[PDB]
Each structure stands twice: as C-alpha cells, then as structure tokens.
C-alpha cells in the first residue's frame, strides 16, 4: 500500500517489480495527491516509469498543486520520459495552478529538444497564463537564447501568414 | 561553495511560525518540497492553533529566498547558498499603509538534512475595523519584483519591495517592506551587486481538508545584471 | 534471454518479475519447444502464470509433443491456473499428437472440478481420439466413479433428446 511510493522515490527498481508482481495499487496518494508515476517522473527513472505505465496507470493524474507527470518530466529535462509519456496519451495542454502549460516550463528551464517535441505533438505557442505571459516572454527574460529564436520564428510565420 | 553544491536536488522544507498579534497568539506549521535548480517551491501550511486571525496573503512573504534560480553567468552574485549550511538571520519591518505594522525575526538553517525557517512575528497598531483583521482581503496573490543591494558593514544584504494586496471591491492595499539578511557563520560569503528578483505565486485550497490551511506554488528568478 | 526458464522452473517469482522488468522475450524455447508459461503450467504457480500472461504471451503454443499449457494444467490438477488460462482465450479443443483433448486428460487424471469447468467452457463429450475412445471410457477403466456418472448423464441426455 504505502511501501510502493518509497521505492519509486528511492530508485529501487527491483522493489517496484516485486511489489507489482504482488497485488499493489499504482494509483496511491499519501497526503498531497502524488503518485509513484509522479515521483518517477521528477527524477529520471525510465525503467520504473515504463513498468508503472505498462501495468496501467493514470497518465494524467492531478496533483494537489495541479501538476501532472508531464509537467515534472518537462521541468526536469528527461527527454525519453517525455517521449514515452506523450506516446501513452498524456495531454499537451494541461494547466498548472499558476496557469502554466508544459511548454511554459520547458521554455522556462531551457531545454531545446523538449520544446521541439512538445511543438511537434500539438502544443500551441501564444497561450497566456494567469499572470498574462506567453512562453516567448519567459524565454527572453531568462537568458534562454535559441528557445526564444524558434518561438519568434513561429510567431513571425503565423503573423506573416495572416497578413495575406 | 559547498553550500551552493548541496542544493543540487530536491530539498524538503519545514517552517514553523509562532505569531502574536495584539495578544492573539497562533502558530503556522508548513511542510513541503523545493527545487533550487529551477526555483520551484511547493508548500502547504496548517494553523495548529484553531482559526487564523489574520488573512493569509499578508503572511506569505513571511513564510526561503535561497531557492531562487540564478542563471550561470550570475552565479557570482548568489549570497544565500553561500551562507549554507550554517544559516542566517532575516529581520523584517512590514509597514502596512494607514494601518499598523509587523516586526519579524527569522532564522533559516539546516537541521539534519531539512531546511527549517523559524519566525517570530509581532504585529501592532491595527484598527479593529481595519480591512486586514476585518477579513476583507481577497484570496489571490500577484507577481512582484524585489530590489536587493549589498552591505559590507553587516556583511549581508539590504532588501526592499512593495506589495499590492487585493481587496473585495477592487481597491488595493499597499504594504512596504524593509529587510536585512545577515549570516550567523563567520566564514566567507558572496557580496552581491545591485539587482532584483522576480516572483510568481499561486494560492489554493485542498478539497479533503477540515483544518485551516493553505496550498502554495511559487516560482522565483533573479535578474538585473544583464551580462551576455 | 535464456535465464528466464530457470526462473519459472524454480518457483522464483521475484526473479521472474525482475527479468521481465528488463527486456526479455517471453516466447523462448531452448531445445524442445517449451515456454516459461509451459514451465509454470507443468508445475503449479498462479503468480508466474498471471505475470507472464499480463506481459503478453502465447497462451496456446504448441509443444513438440503437441501439448499446450491447458493440457499440462488439466493433467496436473491446478484449478486456478485452468480458470485464468480459459479466461485469457485458450482453446479448449486443441488436440494432442495422440489425439487427446484437455477433457480426455482431465478424465484420465481424475479431477472432478476441472472436468466441470471444461464442460462449462465448451468442451464436448463424445469427441473421439486417434485410438477411438471417449472420456467416458477412460472414466470407466480408471476407477473414477462420479466422472463417469456426469459423463453418462450428459451422453444419455443427448441421446434421449435425439430420440424425439
């Protein structure tokens, strides 16, 4: 019941396999809403995420803070986890409590290939947040240089396409 | 600079506030997690003394600026992680416009492997029909900028900012802040340059809770020295 | 890999789910055509059968002697294995090289409840084999008493229904 989450936090993959052979609920949250998938999504653990996903798991489970596994895997920088999470039906337009999308966090941290993946899977550029800023703004006021470059390319492409 | 290197992963945070406002005492115990690599704070606070007398948005700034994201070319200006793991002391005087004031003293330090922040708060001169303790403040919080400069006389930093709190009727109550951060260690620290710190946050509530509480998510970064 | 068959042969559950957490082919045969599912079907385990089945496995894979997991689980006497094998789509009318059905072997060994289950899952009574005998014959020449009774009840019911 409760010694599952401990083994996901801790990187104990063999203990996860042992608990999944026996009866154990993958969808368990302790005090805040947080899942073994959430915990193996913060720290890269591609093996534990894949085995929790193959046994069936809530791919889009709401944290108490509104976060889903995709938000944590986009914030951290693990590309392979983001690929296997997106291929399994995760939503690319899920919102944070501040209003952030996964693309907002990927532009905030400064990972390039994760932005290229989220752009290739249906994330939109000029979606506001609750304080009113787009991912281009977060890219420019945080010293990220080439994230802002491909975002400015997409904005100019849309604007020049509308001008005709 | 080992104190900088120890923030490399997630750090669990516990905070305890013993406050007394006009003889009315209360406690706030908060627990959560923080990521200093990407300036993220996820916390949850509970009042262990019954109903809270003061609105939550006034207490958020009292309730760990060592978790602010500094970019690489500004790693030369990070004072807070330099003062670890010994800790430091923060002194704040909070001036509420046309109301009373707060005076707060805090210590921020590691206990075991958990960053604790202890805080003693004393609030005076508030009028009993004032919008603060008349519970007229709105449950939302805004983005802000905080201006920071050095102080070699106390070997720490001086900090100022000004918060706009939201009222029901669209009015805005302003609170000014004065703050000194001085270490308790005697070793070398980083004396920073004149710059500022940007902050976004969000306040919410837990669905299956019966005590008085608050759930907080926060993002903080630093800027001003716009070097290439 | 080839370390898996030792794992199921042994009864080592934890070492089966560890090898399955890694990349491992469940459809592996060493010298004779025999599968980790076949090995956990000869001896009795419910746990390895269920974890090998959840990871996807050929439920009816022909042994060199023509046996499938259902034949071995009907000869041995493991009832829960037969239930979970039948619910997973195993064929009840797979034939042996000698011509036997799972009902033939269940009548030969003398398990009553396995006969009642296979009768409830679509096995027929008067199906011949290559030497020409029905399960009722095996029941009468092998000292099984009630097996022959419920088989003769079904045979007489079918014959008297045809008589009108």
Residue numbers in the entry:
A (entry chain A), C (entry chain B): 54 to 217
B (entry chain C): 2 to 64, 68 to 232
Sentences from the paper on this structure:
For β4–β6, aside from a few amino-acid residues, the majority of the main and side chains are also clearly presented.
Our most efficacious constructs, namely models 4 and 6c, feature a designed ankyrin-repeat protein (DARPin) rigidly linked to an octahedral human apoferritin via a helical linker. The 24-subunit apoferritin framework allows the attachment of up to 24 target proteins without steric hindrance, an extraordinary feature. The modular design of our scaffold allows the adaptation of new DARPins through minor amino-acid-sequence modifications, enabling the binding and visualization of a diverse array of proteins.
